[model samples]
Target: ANLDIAVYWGQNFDERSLEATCDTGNYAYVIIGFLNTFGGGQTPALDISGHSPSGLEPQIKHCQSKNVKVLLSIGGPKGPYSLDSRSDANDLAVYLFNNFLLPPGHSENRPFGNAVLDGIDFHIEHGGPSQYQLLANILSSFRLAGTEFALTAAPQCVYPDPNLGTVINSATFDAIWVQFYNNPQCSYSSGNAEALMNAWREWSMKARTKKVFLGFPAHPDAAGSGYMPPEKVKFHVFPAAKKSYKFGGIMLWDSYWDTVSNFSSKILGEGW
Candidate 1:
């Protein structure tokens, strides 16, 4: 209960299964990954309509009942969409509020036709300039007005991330999951946590959020590099990370390998 154990909730499993299986005790946040840009546009609406598989809305409802945070992640290495200007960022902010966050309001298309998401996360890896800072600013504007929205990010730890460094530094994200894997420069490696720690401190301080996370790839094959047994994360790396004031928690790349490995035991049995 002292720290968050956030996990990504798509890929390697059907959304329907989570309706009954997304136990809240195991995770503080369950982020739906990569809202891929659909139909080729500068600013795209959610692809949920083209890819609804049922039970996802029910799953979100269940999480809400349990007070678990569930946010949709936008952009990945392959997402071709990006806001070219502050105007579109403002528009996107309004669109997000009306469709994904608005309660009892009008929307052209909701993710599950009705169920509103808890918030949004940026995994922006490609095709975007620093204009995302404006997006963050615009979103935060809504949030400051008492809108119940959570903003977050998943940036690979590289001191200042190549894509989102400026934005992360500028925005007031609720949480920023600094991916401590794949990239050899800042990822955990060889049973050592030094590199990860170095980057972690910088990210925690540079970003406005007090909720910085240790993001890890969850399995042997989930990423290009840096996948460890839960033993290392819970024992070695987690303990090494206590120095940072923003050390709010850990974030797994996904739920599939998390289930496969039974990571609960590895992390002190809150549930996995």
Candidate 2:
């Protein structure tokens, strides 16, 4: 089986439509980003930059038609989001089920109209781990209820990611795409894959997930550091990371930077 290529979409308003993104045939998964506002008595909301939620269903279906799995991501780096308690986490989980996971006939408050997204991705950069673990368990329960409720997470590449280490250890995930950028300690640097590869081994061995993805900044401008040229990744990083039993594939930081660098196209073109 080909390793999945997952991309984070919706943050860049200047980016292409979801249908257009899938048309390129580069991504196996597209994560609609930043549920942004949720929990602690705040009004939960979606922030897809400038895209109209009403206009998203058909586009989502188009991507799904091509076998692209769409997942909704929660808690970006700059959002005001946090869970107060178990009940708060439970409330948010139900909202996700009704608004993003269930079919329109079964759900009344679907933000993306009738589009039933395939999963939920925890990109929790802000918040304590306890309630997130509660949230993960609550959502995981839907696999039997909603069935295709695939669960995933995006943890920073540092071993025992401060934000998601506890949740990752406690919950069963379909995949965990670890961001191997921004943090220079374990992130990629020019001509040196040692730090990143070491972290990859640690994550592959430790994460409580079926598969692990090597996450990267698609373009130099995408993150402060750890952006590798496609050739370097294809030859060095991909080869070593793939050797890990849990290695699933690569995940770019986003759709917009990917378009600029053609990072996904080049890496996928090489055919791992």
Candidate 3:
């Protein structure tokens, strides 16, 4: 069994940079380690800014050979992000699905032909309610266009707000990983386990109980906001898991900061 561990990379596709961050050896170890225990793949980041779909053929091939999934994550906290506009997002979704993500033998000379991306992950940090609807519409359109790719989102983990309504209602997303670290106040009083669990439960109830994933921060002191240590994750996240069966899995913010030693236990315990 392998746990689905997806890493994040800044918008850079340089070979050395990519290898340093997520090389084949690193991925192999993660895959072997998790599969030995749980049963999933180590999905590394494939940022789509500087590189074209065709440019990513080699990386995609490598991942597919290992039975790993390569997901293209769009938008982040940084400035100059895409997917902020509804029109552009719709166009991008159509382009990705029709051109790069069509099924095998469906499109010749397509970069994503044999690569077979598992899905598209949205990291929309600065958007309002309408943007969620736009994103949902885009994903819905992709599904209608004849592809079965998974759609996921990384949203703020605070209590349910009106902003998220569109995403919950419009998109049939496979999962939504709530960021429970940065917004410490949102989950509950800073670092309160019970509060975190209750916040998630409330949000799940409001969203009509769709698939939900939990996100934890591995680096507790990096940003000064309370970072959840691995132990806290095991204690807090595990209890929440026990309470909520809708919990699909857990996701780490970025792989660069999280050490295998500090995070291995919490990650392993979750059985992601």
Candidate 4:
């Protein structure tokens, strides 16, 4: 199965900033094509409790108007801000699901209504085992509240065992964007891609949930140097993965980095 490729847009909500940051026509075309062709969405920095609201509502509205799904991302490694507390998590989820102007009446609790949000994304950067449980509990409450929102998490690809277990057992998330790029093993060796896929396969077999997305980096950051180029990303990573029964999609870390090359097409190509 060809995987869907989605891009992350961090703190690019303000119109002027978006225009300045992503001024290239290539990016606009890629983004438009991504939405029209594969039916994927954009994960904007909607750290609701963060500074200046991350000013992402306009972007979300823009994506929604374009018929592209826009998901609100929560938590990360750095200071976009943190909603690590359990109470905050619960409140944020409720506010997103209920208060946000989703279709068909946000006031009443109704299942299967027009989903205001395509999903809720959790980028759990650093934490202990208990944090996972807390996240799961919050997600479970959202599910039980009759909101069929998709739940996703970003977990380190190298440390797959405990993290996978915590996400799977806690909340029935729609997918897990395994962070394959930053894994030290992945950066050091060519076999990293295969190793990550194998880990996903193992998790799928154990959890019986095939909702897994491959998370790759577009730029060479400190933790993830020697990131795969666009062509290699397509020819190597996607083709090597065993995607028949499992595999939901591919997730790029940020739009700014991706706009530098033809990485989007490589991921969301003819077969995909």
Candidate 5:
């Protein structure tokens, strides 16, 4: 099986429609960006940048029709979101379950009309560990007993992510797309991937999930550092990372930059 690719959508404007992105056949998952407001009684809000709620529904359905699992991502670098207590986490989990994941006919106040997201991706850059762990556990409780909801996270590659270290290790997740960019300590730089590969080994061994993704910036400008050109990843990073049985695949920072650089298109051709 080919390794799956996941990309974050919604934060950047002028990105392809969800259907178009899936149609590219370069991604298996499309994470809708930033339910930037939630917890502590703040009416949770989904920020899909410039996309209209009505317009996104059909696009989501189309993506699903192509077998692309669409997920709602919560907590970006800028959100004021923080779980105040176990009660707050519980409430937010229930709210997300109702609005985004419940069966279509039963869901209420759904942000995307009748479109159902497959799961949640915690891009939790800011939050306390305990409450986030509670939040993830509660969400897991609501997962389909048939199989399960696809819970995942994008923790920084610093081994134990400052915000979500405890949560990722303790909670159950289908995948962990560790951000292998921005941090010089464990990211690729200047034709050298030693640090990144070392971090990959640690992540594969320690992260609780079986599927772990290597997160990359889609383009040079997309991140302050750690943008691996297609050749670098195809040769250096990929071969080294695939040594880990837990390696899932690659995750791009965003869809908009993918459009600019077409990075996924190039790398997907190289196959694992």
Candidate 6:
């Protein structure tokens, strides 16, 4: 199968721990979901010190060795973006690029130490209406500056995500990892294919990129709802989904739980 699989890879002990989990070659990308901003579009400033910052370079290089894209995810679940004004938004774009995106000429806050992340993931659950756009513009500047970078997003299954609804359309994302868990209207329910197909079409059609991953909870316990077994997904969902013009693959909610459930052994097996 040509399906691509990706997973969020923070919440583990260290980067090495995440690297250890990737040896199976089951993932195309390992997103580092960091707690940066509350994510709206406006913010005085967002923070990034919630998770451990050890072995960043080792894991990044390791992922690179396997041809995996390791990018930093910003604004997960919830938070606030204080860049309320137009000027503030512009400042954040440059600020984010210089402070976080830059390898490090003098910043002490380099999480990846000497490594430069491939790009950023806008998971933005809530925040500034124009915040993500600001960061995106900054990323564009880097591209013009001769610095390469990738951009992606994680929006809920609900079509036209509540927070990033406008922002998502305004920007260009290389990949979109839609949350198919949590929400019942669009998530996978054993026999419910129509809803998922509708939602998938809605996302894949409007998204800027051709890489759209159907995101699911790695384990039954990983999400409160929409927890179809890996076998059920590949067998039931894959067929219809594979017909999608932009279908890339599946995106498990995370790697930690998959480690606990050993889902990759099944997901990346024969049928995969």
Query: What would the TM-scores of all predictions be?
Result: 0.88, 0.95, 0.70, 0.67, 0.94, 0.86
Clashing pairs in 4: none
- lDDT, candidate 3, 107-183, per-residue tens: 44554345656677666665456455665676777777777777766677765544455676554777777776666
Looking at model 4, which ten-residue stretch has the lowest summed lDDT?
30-39
TM match of model 4 to true structure:
0.67
Winner of 1 and 6 under TM-score: 1
Give the poorly placed runs of model 1, Cα more than 4 Å off. 13-16, 38-54, 270-272
TM-score of 6: 0.86
lDDT of 2 by residue, 1-272 (tens): 36579999997788978888888888999999989998878989989998998899999999999899999999886788888688889999988887788776653567888888999899988665758888888788887774577889898888788888898897578999999999988988877888988898898888988889989999999999999888898788766777778888889998988888888878877432
**Candidate 4 overall Cα lDDT vs. reference?**
0.51
- How many clashing residue pairs appear in each of the predictions shown? 0, 0, 7, 0, 0, 17
Candidate 1 local lDDT, 1-272, one digit each (tens): 36668888776444324544466377788887657663234556444333353447777888878888888888765656776666767777777777677774563556555677878999888754557788788788888887788999888788677778778777578788888888888877887777776777677777777688888877777788878777777677676577777788888877767776656446756553
Write the residue-wise lDDT of candidate 6 on 100-170 in tens digits.
Answer: 56767873565567767778888877654655566576677777797787888898988788766776786
Q: What is the lDDT of residue 197 in candidate 5?
A: 86
- Of 1 and 5, the candidate ranking higher by lDDT: 5
Candidate closer to the true structure by TM-score (higher is better), 2 or 4? 2
Q: Write the per-residue lDDT of candidate 5 for residues 1-272, one digit (tens) a residue.
A: 37689999887667777778888888999998889988777888877887887788999999999899999998986777888788888888888887788756653467788878899999888765848888887888778544256899999999788888888878488899999999989999977888888898899899999799989999999999998888788887777777778889999998989988989878877322
- Alpha-carbon runs more than 4 Å astray in model 2: 105-107, 270-272
Q: Which scores greater on lDDT, model 1 or model 3?
A: 1
- Top-down lDDT ranking: 2, 5, 1, 6, 3, 4
Candidate 4 on 1-272: residue-level lDDT in tens? 44466556643333223333233222321121011110012222333222243244454455555545555555565433334466644555554556442465635543223435566666655444534456566666767777666666666665453434566655477666666665555332463555555665555455435566666776665234436666666666566455445666666766656655546655555322
Task: State which candidate has the highest TM-score.
Answer: 2
Give the clashing pairs for model 5.
none
Ranking by TM-score: 2, 5, 1, 6, 3, 4
Error of 3 at 64 (Å): 3.1
Better of 2 and 5 by TM-score: 2
